[PDB]
Write an enzyme that holds these catalytic residues in place. Structure first.
Site, PDB file in Angstrom:
ATOM      1  N   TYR A 107      49.318 -31.788 -46.837  1.00  0.00           N
ATOM      2  CA  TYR A 107      50.100 -30.686 -47.139  1.00  0.00           C
ATOM      3  C   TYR A 107      49.164 -29.206 -47.215  1.00  0.00           C
ATOM      4  CZ  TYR A 107      53.318 -34.153 -48.664  1.00  0.00           C
ATOM      5  OH  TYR A 107      54.200 -35.205 -48.544  1.00  0.00           O
ATOM      6  N   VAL A 137      47.093 -25.714 -46.301  1.00  0.00           N
ATOM      7  CA  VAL A 137      45.736 -25.396 -45.589  1.00  0.00           C
ATOM      8  C   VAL A 137      44.795 -25.007 -46.596  1.00  0.00           C
ATOM      9  CG1 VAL A 137      44.798 -24.072 -43.497  1.00  0.00           C
ATOM     10  CG2 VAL A 137      47.467 -24.387 -43.621  1.00  0.00           C
ATOM     11  N   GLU A 192      37.466 -24.398 -57.412  1.00  0.00           N
ATOM     12  CA  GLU A 192      36.126 -24.066 -57.160  1.00  0.00           C
ATOM     13  C   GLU A 192      35.826 -24.663 -55.957  1.00  0.00           C
ATOM     14  OE1 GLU A 192      35.495 -27.476 -60.713  1.00  0.00           O
ATOM     15  OE2 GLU A 192      33.792 -26.599 -59.631  1.00  0.00           O
ATOM     16  N   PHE A 193      34.731 -24.083 -55.151  1.00  0.00           N
ATOM     17  CA  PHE A 193      34.449 -24.525 -53.797  1.00  0.00           C
ATOM     18  C   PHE A 193      33.249 -25.328 -53.966  1.00  0.00           C
ATOM     19  CE2 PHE A 193      31.549 -23.932 -50.028  1.00  0.00           C
ATOM     20  CZ  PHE A 193      32.227 -24.107 -49.052  1.00  0.00           C
ATOM     21  N   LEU A 194      33.401 -26.660 -53.183  1.00  0.00           N
ATOM     22  CA  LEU A 194      32.227 -27.559 -53.306  1.00  0.00           C
ATOM     23  C   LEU A 194      31.732 -27.700 -51.735  1.00  0.00           C
ATOM     24  CD1 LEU A 194      31.722 -28.986 -56.123  1.00  0.00           C
ATOM     25  CD2 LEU A 194      34.102 -28.312 -55.912  1.00  0.00           C
ATOM     26  N   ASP A 220      43.383 -43.777 -54.885  1.00  0.00           N
ATOM     27  CA  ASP A 220      42.856 -43.247 -53.431  1.00  0.00           C
ATOM     28  C   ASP A 220      41.076 -42.762 -53.468  1.00  0.00           C
ATOM     29  OD1 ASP A 220      43.385 -42.977 -50.656  1.00  0.00           O
ATOM     30  OD2 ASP A 220      43.139 -40.794 -50.950  1.00  0.00           O
ATOM     31  N   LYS A 259      37.739 -42.671 -52.456  1.00  0.00           N
ATOM     32  CA  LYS A 259      36.951 -42.871 -51.199  1.00  0.00           C
ATOM     33  C   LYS A 259      36.023 -41.925 -50.819  1.00  0.00           C
ATOM     34  CE  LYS A 259      40.713 -41.524 -48.367  1.00  0.00           C
ATOM     35  NZ  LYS A 259      41.292 -40.775 -47.193  1.00  0.00           N
ATOM     36  N   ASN A 264      36.856 -38.123 -50.473  1.00  0.00           N
ATOM     37  CA  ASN A 264      37.794 -37.473 -51.425  1.00  0.00           C
ATOM     38  C   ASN A 264      36.373 -37.111 -52.580  1.00  0.00           C
ATOM     39  OD1 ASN A 264      40.523 -39.417 -51.115  1.00  0.00           O
ATOM     40  ND2 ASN A 264      40.224 -37.479 -50.009  1.00  0.00           N
TER      41      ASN A 264
HETATM   42  N1  LIG Z   1      37.967 -27.167 -53.886  1.00  0.00           N
HETATM   43  C1  LIG Z   1      37.505 -27.675 -52.774  1.00  0.00           C
HETATM   44  N2  LIG Z   1      36.270 -27.421 -52.297  1.00  0.00           N
HETATM   45  C2  LIG Z   1      35.718 -27.516 -51.036  1.00  0.00           C
HETATM   46  N3  LIG Z   1      36.682 -28.260 -50.345  1.00  0.00           N
HETATM   47  C3  LIG Z   1      37.806 -28.689 -50.466  1.00  0.00           C
HETATM   48  C4  LIG Z   1      38.475 -28.272 -51.694  1.00  0.00           C
HETATM   49  N4  LIG Z   1      39.592 -28.663 -51.985  1.00  0.00           N
HETATM   50  C5  LIG Z   1      39.881 -29.460 -50.582  1.00  0.00           C
HETATM   51  N5  LIG Z   1      38.811 -29.239 -49.672  1.00  0.00           N
HETATM   52  C6  LIG Z   1      38.737 -29.795 -48.636  1.00  0.00           C
HETATM   53  O1  LIG Z   1      40.050 -29.370 -47.787  1.00  0.00           O
HETATM   54  C7  LIG Z   1      40.399 -30.560 -46.811  1.00  0.00           C
HETATM   55  C8  LIG Z   1      42.020 -30.704 -47.045  1.00  0.00           C
HETATM   56  O2  LIG Z   1      41.894 -31.444 -48.196  1.00  0.00           O
HETATM   57  P1  LIG Z   1      43.541 -31.759 -48.822  1.00  0.00           P
HETATM   58  O3  LIG Z   1      44.596 -31.511 -47.826  1.00  0.00           O
HETATM   59  O4  LIG Z   1      43.554 -31.350 -50.268  1.00  0.00           O
HETATM   60  O5  LIG Z   1      43.165 -33.527 -48.991  1.00  0.00           O
HETATM   61  P2  LIG Z   1      44.335 -34.572 -48.387  1.00  0.00           P
HETATM   62  O6  LIG Z   1      45.301 -33.986 -47.136  1.00  0.00           O
HETATM   63  O7  LIG Z   1      43.647 -35.682 -48.341  1.00  0.00           O
HETATM   64  O8  LIG Z   1      45.341 -34.788 -49.607  1.00  0.00           O
HETATM   65  C9  LIG Z   1      39.760 -31.687 -47.361  1.00  0.00           C
HETATM   66  O9  LIG Z   1      38.778 -32.115 -46.334  1.00  0.00           O
HETATM   67  C10 LIG Z   1      38.736 -31.301 -48.436  1.00  0.00           C
HETATM   68  O10 LIG Z   1      37.649 -31.875 -48.383  1.00  0.00           O
HETATM   69 MG   LIG Z   2      43.189 -37.711 -48.627  1.00  0.00          MG
END
Ligand SMILES: Nc1ncnc2c1ncn2[C@@H]1O[C@H](COP(=O)(O)OP(=O)(O)O)[C@@H](O)[C@H]1O
Ligand SMILES: [Mg+2]
Ligand SMILES: Nc1ncnc2c1ncn2[C@@H]1O[C@H](COP(=O)(O)OP(=O)(O)O)[C@@H](O)[C@H]1O
Ligand SMILES: [Mg+2]
Ligand SMILES: [Mg+2]
Ligand SMILES: [Mg+2]
Lengths: 65, 301, 276, 277
Positions: free
Chosen positions: C14, C16, C65-67, C111, C113, C116
């Site tokens: 879901y 962007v 927070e950005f990782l 979930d 992995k 994640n």
């Molecule tokens: N706070 C964050 N910092 C860095 N990357 C993120 C963060 N949140 C999400 N992402 C990245 O954004 C992408 C979309 O993730 P998301 O849509 O939330 O996961 P999923 O579709 O599996 O539920 C993922 O590849 C994730 O690694």
């Molecule tokens: Mg996922």
């Protein structure tokens, strides 16, 4: 209006390719690798590979741009 | 700015579909925007599923196969343009307000089988046949769609990836881990779709691979080695308790004899013996009366 | 208005994800309840933090927070040199603290992995992607037909059990632990049956002695091949006695006998844990 | 299938005059763009052709030494992509090195050869690899647009195998068609060096290679054409097929490989052209 089966006709611009069931009897299958029992259990036969190779060999053999 | 987005149709896990108009022909189209996905798949460039759909739909042209009108993008983003389809077969099936007469079922089967026959003549397996992948237009023309799993077959030593359809429509050779197969997988899915059309509910609604195999064998009987000659050699084979199965005239009590023969042909356990699309089209059920209804007369939800 | 979008990160199930700047942050734009609330409830150094939730009439915005990268990319980069053992131990310790916090609040990730698990530059690791999460009894997303990765599923789920326990998360963590030690998946199955047979071939076929109640599972079959149990020395050569013992306790067939996160934190393996 | 493919409809041309005309049109269009932007640094079309041939050889080398083993069909698809791209574009605008790498990268994904992007870019000969991956990703969509989203490429190898099967079945005169495989493969490589892939159908190329190998070995196989293929009934079709083969052989003997010193001078010219605009 009842339905009637009409064969699919596509121009191939090449020599006639023998029918799939006829390949073994005409001796084509003596020159391809045999299908393993595991392959056969899924429905993959050597006739399919031979038929594809022949169709590609004869496709557009005499066609001019 | 060629397309004017004007409606949101739906969002899946891997793509988003909108309605738009071409602004040049004023034609209503559906735009499938492909999601980048996770951070790793974004670095690998344009999505492989979009490339597969583009490369396969650029080489096919049949009335009952969805047509790719255009494709654009920016950087790794990509959008596929299709003709707009009013509804699909699953919506027709689940709609309790409309009655599926035998002629409607025959018409829906005919269009699906003609599309499948054209597809198989070009050595391509759809591999994802199910009611929501059979789209219906405003003029009642069925088209196969969702070619993200489709793949060419025939060349040996091409096992490749293990991607399979949702389990309700998976063929038993696929559930047993077969890597090399032919048109049988699509034919089993076609039989499952016909069963869904006849019962108005999913025929074999398993909740796991093993549960799906259990339901298949309880409904149609456990096959022996005479019915499926090399079944025990498949990689994911497990022995099952022997089940007598239910006679098909009990499951489908309103089905006539010709339709019963078609169903037995579609649900044969031996993949080689299972009828193909051409053989199914030559079956007496389609030539018998009454004929399939015209597409303009098909039920609309 | 305050946030300046920098670029697009990705487009998951879901919305962007956007790299933005106010401090580098991550913004999720969802089309327009349980998941946001669960994220506000879960405050922990080892869980991704929901900073602010901007609400619009047709849109929803979530700030995190950005990782800089996740664990999967990190293992991909370190495929040849490997990941140092202290880094493995620190990451496992932090993930176990986060898991214990989630379980104390009756939260089931379901979930786990490597894709994640998000890391940063200073050596911290956090749990993310609570889309399949199970809080108390209800799922956070009541309607989700999303595909689930199969390499980290517990055997009880593979045998059709509908009673999800916390132990499943432990199972997944154990697999990830093994992966981080071997740079390879422990059970890379092509399907559900192949996944289960890889598990059986690695640990032996479960019988009523080791897993009581296994023959009455919804999808148990008496004809299952009776593989033997190979020792853990070959399956995970690099690991030590404490690490092997912890991995074995984390990979028990019986969920009730499987170790818990709090009990795992007290294991001798983490005696000399130090974050590098 | 080839007989209703996009390759046959849009990417097979009537004569090499059309090919030269499209390439000259590309060169002139780039010159007009540059001179409207605001002279000896420009390259003439034959110099562009020499550079394209040199970098096509480089792409062959790259796909040959690629690990894991690159399937030969994927290599063929990549080379056809390179030819089709530089049919309508100038090397003075897009550098042939980056475009050749992008062609290989798109070919691997289109032909279902699954390789992770880090490994692909690691096949190159550090930070330079990362930058190269960045340029490949930047040029992927450009390459796909320049191909008109026509990604399926029909190679001659499968028709070659089909002809070998048919000869083994219906041509007892040939004791062993496998004696012809090596020399036919070499001739296929030589043909792929030229522009025949844009001028003839894959089956014609395969059959020309087979008959060329037979002639070099001394065997005569006009019986196979007249009798097995049922061409003795339709002689005009036989004449067209023979003339197609003669034209292909002429293209093969008239081909000239690029010279080293000319390639060095042209590489210097192209590099100077790619640092001044
Ligand atoms: N706070 C964050 N910092 C860095 N990357 C993120 C963060 N949140 C999400 N992402 C990245 O954004 C992408 C979309 O993730 P998301 O849509 O939330 O996961 P999923 O579709 O599996 O539920 C993922 O590849 C994730 O690694
Ligand atoms: Mg996922
Ligand atoms: N040409 C079209 N016209 C109208 N709706 C479409 C069209 N193509 C797809 N859709 C809608 O998009 C939805 C998902 O399409 P699909 O290709 O199956 O996505 P996915 O591959 O994610 O399953 C379908 O339910 C269908 O209603
Ligand atoms: Mg679909
Ligand atoms: Mg799909
Ligand atoms: Mg999620």
């Amino acid at each position: 209006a009842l339905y009637e089966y009409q064969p699919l006709q596509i121009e191939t611009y090449g020599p006639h390719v023998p029918e799939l069931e006829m390949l073994g009897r005409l001796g084509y299958l003596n020159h391809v690798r045999a299908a393993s029992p595991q392959d056969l259990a899924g429905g993959y036969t050597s006739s399919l590979a031979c038929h594809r190779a022949l169709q590609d060999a004869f496709s557009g053999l005499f066609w001019q741009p | 700015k060629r397309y004017e987005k004007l409606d949101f149709l739906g969002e899946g896990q891997f793509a988003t579909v909108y309605k738009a108009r071409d602004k040049n022909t004023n034609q209503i189209v559906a735009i499938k925007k492909i999601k980048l996905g996770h951070r790793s798949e974004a670095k690998d460039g344009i999505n492989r599923t979009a490339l597969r759909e583009i490369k396969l739909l650029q080489e096919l042209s049949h009335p009952n196969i969805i047509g790719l009108l255009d494709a654009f993008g920016h950087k790794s983003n990509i959008s596929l343009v299709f003709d707009f389809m009013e509804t699909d077969l699953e919506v027709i099936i689940k709609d309790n307000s409309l009655v599926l007469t035998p002629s409607h079922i025959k018409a829906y089967m005919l269009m699906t089988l003609q599309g499948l026959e054209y597809l198989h003549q070009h050595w391509i397996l759809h591999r994802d046949l199910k009611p929501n992948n059979l789209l219906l237009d405003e003029n009642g023309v069925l088209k196969l769609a969702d070619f993200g799993l489709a793949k060419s077959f025939g060349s040996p030593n091409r096992a490749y990836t293990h991607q399979v359809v949702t389990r309700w429509y998976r063929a038993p050779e696929l559930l047993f881990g077969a890597r090399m197969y032919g048109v049988g997988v699509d034919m089993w899915a076609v039989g499952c779709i016909l069963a869904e059309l006849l019962l108005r509910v999913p025929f074999l609604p398993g909740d796991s691979d093993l549960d799906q195999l259990t339901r298949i064998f309880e409904t149609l009987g456990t096959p022996t080695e005479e019915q499926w000659p090399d079944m025990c050699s498949l990689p994911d084979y497990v022995t099952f308790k022997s089940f007598p199965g239910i006679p098909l005239h009990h499951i489908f009590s309103a089905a006539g004899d010709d339709l019963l023969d078609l169903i037995q042909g579609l649900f044969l356990f031996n993949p080689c013996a299972r009828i193909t699309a051409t053989q199914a089209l030559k079956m007496k059920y389609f030539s018998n009366r009454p004929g399939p209804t015209p597409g303009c007369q098909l039920p609309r939800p | 208005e305050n946030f300046q979008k920098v670029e697009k990160i990705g487009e998951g199930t879901y919305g962007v994800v956007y790299k933005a700047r106010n401090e580098v942050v991550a913004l999720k734009k969802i089309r327009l309840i349980r998941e946001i609330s669960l994220l506000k409830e879960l405050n922990h150094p080892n869980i991704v933090k929901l900073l602010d939730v901007i609400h619009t009439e047709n849109k929803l915005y979530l700030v995190f927070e950005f990782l800089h990268q996740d664990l999967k990319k990190f293992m991909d980069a370190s495929a040849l040199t490997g990941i140092p053992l202290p880094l493995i131990k620190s990451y496992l310790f932090q993930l176990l603290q986060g898991l214990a916090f989630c379980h104390s609040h009756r939260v089931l990730h379901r979930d786990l992995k490597p894709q994640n698990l998000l890391i940063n530059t200073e050596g911290a690791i956090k749990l993310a992607d609570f889309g399949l999460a199970r809080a108390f009894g209800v799922p956070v997303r009541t309607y989700t037909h999303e595909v689930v990765t199969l390499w980290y599923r517990a055997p009880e789920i593979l045998l059709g059990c509908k009673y999800y326990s916390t132990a499943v998360d432990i199972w997944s963590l154990g697999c990830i632990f093994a992966e981080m030690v071997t740079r390879r998946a422990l059970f890379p199955g092509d399907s559900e049956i192949d996944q289960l047979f890889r598990i059986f071939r690695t640990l032996g076929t479960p019988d009523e002695v080791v897993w009581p109640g296994v023959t009455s599972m919804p999808d148990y079959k008496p004809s299952f091949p009776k593989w033997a149990r190979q020792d853990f020395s070959k399956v995970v050569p690099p690991l030590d006695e404490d690490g092997r013992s912890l991995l074995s306790q984390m990979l028990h067939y019986d969920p009730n006998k499987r170790i818990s996160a709090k009990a795992a934190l007290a294991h001798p393996f983490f005696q000399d844990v130090t974050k590098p | 299938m080839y007989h209703n493919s996009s390759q046959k409809r849009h990417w097979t041309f009537s004569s090499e005059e059309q090919l030269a005309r499209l390439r000259a049109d590309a060169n002139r269009k780039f010159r007009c763009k540059a001179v409207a932007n605001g002279d000896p640094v420009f390259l003439e079309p034959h110099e562009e052709m020499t550079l394209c041939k040199y970098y096509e050889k480089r792409l062959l080398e790259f796909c040959s030494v690629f690990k894991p083993a690159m399937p030969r069909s994927v290599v063929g698809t990549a080379c056809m992509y390179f030819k089709r791209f530089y049919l309508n574009n100038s090397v003075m605008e897009y550098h042939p090195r980056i475009i050749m790498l992008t062609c290989a990268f798109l070919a691997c994904k289109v032909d279902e050869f699954n390789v992770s992007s880090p490994q692909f870019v690691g096949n190159l000969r550090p930070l330079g690899q990362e930058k190269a991956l960045e340029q490949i990703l930047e040029y992927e969509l450009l390459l796909i647009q320049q191909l008109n989203f026509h990604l399926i490429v029909h190679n001659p190898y499968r028709p070659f195998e089909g002809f070998l099967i048919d000869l083994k079945t219906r041509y007892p005169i040939l004791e062993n068609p496998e004696i012809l495989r090596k020399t036919a493969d070499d001739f296929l490589n030589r043909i792929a060096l030229t522009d025949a892939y844009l001028l003839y159908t894959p089956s014609q190329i395969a059959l020309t290679a087979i008959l060329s190998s037979a002639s070099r070995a001394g065997i005569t196989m006009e019986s196979y054409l007249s009798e097995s293929l049922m061409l003795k009934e339709n002689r005009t079709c036989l004449s067209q097929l023979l003339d197609i083969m003669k034209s292909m052989r002429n293209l093969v003997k008239k081909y000239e490989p690029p010279r080293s010193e000319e390639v060095a001078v042209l590489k210097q010219k192209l590099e100077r052209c790619h640092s001044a605009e």
